[PDB]
Design a protein around this ligand. Structure first.
Ligand code: FE
Length: 835
């Protein structure tokens, strides 16, 4: 008829296929032709007799359009032609069927020459397999934004039925082409059939945990409540592909545990070619300095590896080396100064654990019936000798006395951790003081362990005080070392894995099952969900599993992920909001005359100043976006899909805490904006701040040690005398050994790197994600408000008064700053939790 011209853009498999990228009249676009991809339009305006929008005639792709519109690197363009029975109406969706054996990546479709109407865009960005591998036809929709009620009457069957496709039926073993999003428990970490069973985390009150994407594999012979090892399913469009093999960071990790870590083991324990121990701090450094000399046979196996090439330089071919962790401009600090040990609690890798003291001595909230007294044995008199004239009550009232308190987190797991074969750790407490130049000063480090029975005086506590001169400075350095083993343990499992990765995948599954492609709050939030179900999947398979990388490298060992469950009991959604986090830890006082409505107790607390400007910027954007679509609390009350999404996020996603009073409703405009802000703050900035500084500070194992293998040496004993004689063997003897150190440095380096692409906070995958010029305009104000913040990061970093912003390591805290480039940067806030 008056025939609608259509334009399809797609990408073959292989431009995004790692394997085909690495390689494991002429015309190729000519084959996606004839009877190979067909398409049918669906009407937003006209209906059949049951009330559902019309479907109009299956028409195959016409020609390979050779020219660039603009396209996008490896994109191939094509035209389809649809006729016009006038009475069809304007198309608001289409159905696509591929008849080819192999999938492709559909990226867009545009519709031209609709008489009376302008060009209709579709933002597709989805893998389309051969029809026969799909339940029913794929439906792609127009980029217009609609609440449930506002959906065109013709498009409602279509909108509400495609959901049912995303939810599936809660049964069956999922296949890779499938897009079914659903929930299961973490019962896939252990291998019981092989002797290494782990407790089922989730679905219990003894073992609470966020639920995760259901995979549906067969059961274990030993425990048919646990699922077998196999390859992890993620719903197909959650596995994001790439042009460039260096950007498949998951392949880099898969190859770490598989190819490399076993060669390093062959090297240390086959013939001992390189020793299992370090003898000095120069040895640990001569890995990013000269490098570790491995034989040519081990190097020549790592040197070809198509996905580990950015992570180390294998070449030199007798040596494996690198990278210099950013704790080097000064090599003598990180690893050593007292003012940097304290500076990293507020601007380091783990910046949101630190409380303020309000009573002295410090307490325990543990349970006196189960753990004994547990109160800190540190006295007024230990603190005060370094408080420079200040009495503890003076500092308590002037909000100068602070703490890093790992007592209650560790003491429950320390009988079990200390009876593991190569471990002998403490549950630590570190008092910090705020000096007049605005710097933190460690005053004392207490070290506890239950000793045997474990509900009596067990705690067995010692207090170690600051020292510059003698043996006492070596016992301080070993006390600070035990403190940072707790801290590294906690950061990995709690600050990073649980409070960002594990806790998000519930909302990510909820959004896909209950908010249509068409939904206002799907468009807002979906960027923040990119590649989270995918690194979580690999993590459940290769990092978080039995005798994997986090258990081998961190103190709790087999009890690691179980530790994040005990700590999960205490996770509060509403406390994940940075002002609420800050206010609850004593580091912010709620103030109306003040800045972000809070007065900071430690004013040069670099993270909280990242934080608050990226927090208000996120919140101003969500407040303005929500305000475009929900005019009234009644609109937030009336959204049939938002209620459903949120009812499920809580009750099935975070099911083991569904009953908590702190869980918000979705009855007002302010409740939507803040739930969405916390989710947007978690996925973008929280993760940035606790992920990208990992190889920067933890790249030196002397700075951030992960394992603790001996207690403080006993006086008048052979191992104490070796602490007087060779202090750096007494240290290295305490912390992570050579094999564990090369497993550690090697994953936290991959995890600290940004891909070429990545998409940072004020960015979006495509410009036309919505047809709302106002949503797009308030998104460019958001982008512009974030470049301003970069600008004030760079000047506070250039401001010499703000000491904590650089410190002895002379590292400008830039983990705050949205913009960054590939890799190794100590900068950059992604949209998502993408590694
Ligand atoms: Fe991460």
């Amino acid at each position: 008829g008056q025939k609608i011209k259509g334009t399809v853009v797609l990408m073959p498999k292989n431009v995004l296929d790692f394997n085909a990228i690495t390689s494991i009249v002429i015309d190729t676009a000519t084959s996606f032709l004839g009877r190979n991809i067909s398409m049918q339009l669906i009407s937003a305006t006209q209906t059949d007799g049951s009330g559902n929008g019309k479907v109009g005639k299956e028409v195959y792709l016409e020609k390979h359009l050779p020219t660039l519109p603009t396209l996008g690197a490896r994109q191939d363009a094509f035209s389809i032609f649809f006729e016009w029975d006038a009475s069809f109406g304007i198309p608001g969706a289409f159905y696509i069927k591929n008849f080819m054996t192999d999938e492709f990546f559909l990226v867009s479709v545009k519709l031209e020459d609709i008489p009376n109407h302008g060009t209709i865009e579709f933002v597709c960005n989805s893998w389309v397999y051969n029809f026969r591998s799909y339940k029913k036809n794929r439906i792609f929709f127009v980029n217009d934004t609609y609440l449930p009620s506002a959906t065109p009457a013709p498009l409602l069957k279509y909108r509400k039925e495609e959901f049912e496709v995303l939810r599936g039926d809660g049964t069956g073993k999922r296949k890779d082409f499938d897009r079914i999003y659903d929930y299961d428990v973490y019962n896939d970490l252990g291998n019981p059939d092989g002797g290494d069973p782990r407790p089922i985390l989730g679905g219990c009150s003894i073992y609470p945990y966020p639920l995760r994407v259901r995979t549906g594999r067969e059961r274990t012979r030993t425990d048919p409540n646990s699922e077998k090892p196999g390859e992890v399913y993620v719903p197909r469009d959650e596995n994001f592909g790439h042009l460039k093999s260096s950007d498949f960071l998951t392949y880099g990790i898969k190859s770490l545990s598989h190819d490399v870590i076993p060669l390093f083991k062959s090297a240390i324990f086959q013939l001992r070619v390189t020793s299992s121990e370090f003898e000095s701090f120069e040895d640990v450094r001569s890995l990013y300095e000269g490098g570790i000399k491995l034989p040519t046979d081990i190097l020549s196996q790592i040197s070809p590896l198509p996905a580990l090439k950015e992570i180390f330089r294998t070449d030199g071919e007798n040596v494996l080396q690198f990278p210099p962790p950013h704790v080097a401009k000064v090599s003598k600090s990180g690893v050593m100064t007292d003012e940097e040990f304290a500076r990293e609690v507020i601007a380091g890798v783990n910046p949101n654990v630190i409380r303020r003291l309000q009573e002295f001595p410090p307490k325990s909230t543990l349970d006196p019936t189960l753990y004994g007294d547990q109160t800190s044995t540190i006295t007024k008199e230990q603190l005060e000798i370094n408080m420079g004239g200040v009495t503890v009550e003076e500092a308590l009232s002037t909000q100068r006395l602070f703490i890093l308190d790992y007592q209650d987190a560790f003491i429950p797991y320390l009988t079990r951790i200390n009876s593991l074969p190569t471990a002998k750790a403490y549950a630590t407490r570190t008092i910090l003081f705020l000096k007049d130049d605005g710097t933190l000063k460690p005053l004392a480090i207490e070290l506890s362990k239950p000793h045997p029975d474990g509900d009596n005086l067990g705690p067995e506590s010692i207090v170690v005080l600051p020292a510059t001169e003698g043996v006492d400075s070596t016992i301080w350095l070993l006390a600070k070392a035990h403190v940072i083993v707790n801290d590294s343990g906690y950061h990995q499992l709690v600050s990073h894995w649980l409070n960002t990765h594990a806790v998000m995948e519930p909302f990510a599954i909820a959004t896909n099952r209950h908010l249509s492609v068409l939904h206002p709050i799907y468009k807002l939030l979906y960027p923040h969900y990119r590649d989270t179900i995918n690194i979580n999947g690999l993590a459940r398979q290769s990092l978080i599993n039995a005798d994997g990388i986090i258990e081998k490298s961190f103190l709790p060992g087999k009890y690691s992920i179980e530790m994040s469950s005990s700590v999960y009991k205490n996770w509060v959604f509403t406390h994940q909001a940075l002002p609420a986090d800050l206010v609850k830890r004593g580091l912010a006082i709620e103030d109306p005359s003040a800045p972000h409505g809070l007065r900071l107790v430690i004013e040069d607390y670099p993270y909280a100043v990242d934080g608050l400007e990226i927090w208000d910027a996120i919140k101003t954007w969500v407040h303005e976006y929500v305000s475009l679509y929900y005019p009234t609390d009644a609109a937030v009350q009336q959204d049939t899909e938002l209620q459903a999404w949120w009812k499920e996020a809580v009750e099935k996603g975070h099911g083991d805490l569904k009953e908590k009073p702190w869980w918000p409703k979705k009855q007002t405009t302010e409740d939507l904006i803040q739930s969405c802000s916390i989710i947007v703050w978690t996925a973008s900035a929280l993760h940035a701040a606790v992920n990208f500084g990992q190889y920067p500070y933890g790249g030196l194992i002397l700075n951030r040690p992960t394992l603790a293998r001996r207690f403080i040496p006993a006086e008048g004993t052979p191992e104490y005398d070796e602490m007087v004689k060779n202090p750096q063997k007494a240290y290295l003897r305490t912390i992570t050994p050579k094999f564990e150190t090369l497993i550690d440095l090697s994953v936290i380096e991959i995890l600290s790197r940004h891909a070429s692409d990545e998409i940072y906070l004020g960015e979006r995958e495509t410009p036309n994600w919505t047809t709302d010029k106002k949503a797009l305009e308030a998104f460019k104000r958001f982008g512009s408000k974030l470049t301003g913040i970069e600008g004030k990061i760079n000047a506070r970093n250039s401001d010499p008064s703000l000491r904590n912003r650089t410190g002895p390591v002379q590292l400008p805290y830039t983990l705050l700053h949205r913009s960054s480039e590939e890799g190794l940067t100590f900068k950059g806030i992604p949209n998502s939790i993408s590694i």
